[PDB]
Structure 1
């Protein structure tokens, strides 16, 4: 995850962004589909 503290009003910002490792969790169970929450 990265917060990206920059302003692009409507779409993805042009700039290059790097994502750093934050959380690791062990599950062992295959995830195949998923959904988002409002």
Structure 2
């Protein structure tokens, strides 16, 4: 998220046992990273190996 020039990154890692589906369950996100840049972002891409 990016509010008032603050980019917020909320994250979680979980060990799972599932092949092609998104797991049915509940999991809160701890707030982890905030970064005060101040830019207008419109598009985004991932990067693989």
Question: Normalising by structure 1, what TM-score?
Answer: 0.80
Please list every run of 5 or more consecutive structure 2 residues that lacks an aligned counterpart in the other structure.
Answer: 1-10
Runs of 4 or more, structure 1, over 2 Å off, are none
Higher strand residue share:
2
RMSD: 1.0
Q: Name the count of aligned residue pairs.
A: 38
Unaligned runs of 5+ in 1: none
